[PDB]
């Protein structure tokens, strides 16, 4: 995307703190390790790079 470039920062992902599809492609707001900083990353790319972090996020918000 033009917008999600968080992984270009080269920091270790720690936890997704939000998500949006408001720019078409699903993004996550990713918090990095040992900082309060977060940045938008593409979901497609997080799926590959930090699948457990992606899943932990989906799991935390299951509804029936």
């Amino acid at each position: 995307n033009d917008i999600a470039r968080g992984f270009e920062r080269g920091l270790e992902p720690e936890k997704i703190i939000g998500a949006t599809d408001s720019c078409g492609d699903l993004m996550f707001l990713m918090k990095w390790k040992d900082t309060d900083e977060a940045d938008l990353v593409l979901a497609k790319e997080a799926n590959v790079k930090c699948p457990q972090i992606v899943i932990a996020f989906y799991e935390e918000r299951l509804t029936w």
Binding site: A19, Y58, R61, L62, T63, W64
Partner: peptide, 6 residues
């Protein structure tokens, strides 16, 4: 605010 609905 997302919520995966199953």
């Amino acid at each position: 605010v997302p919520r995966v609905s199953l």
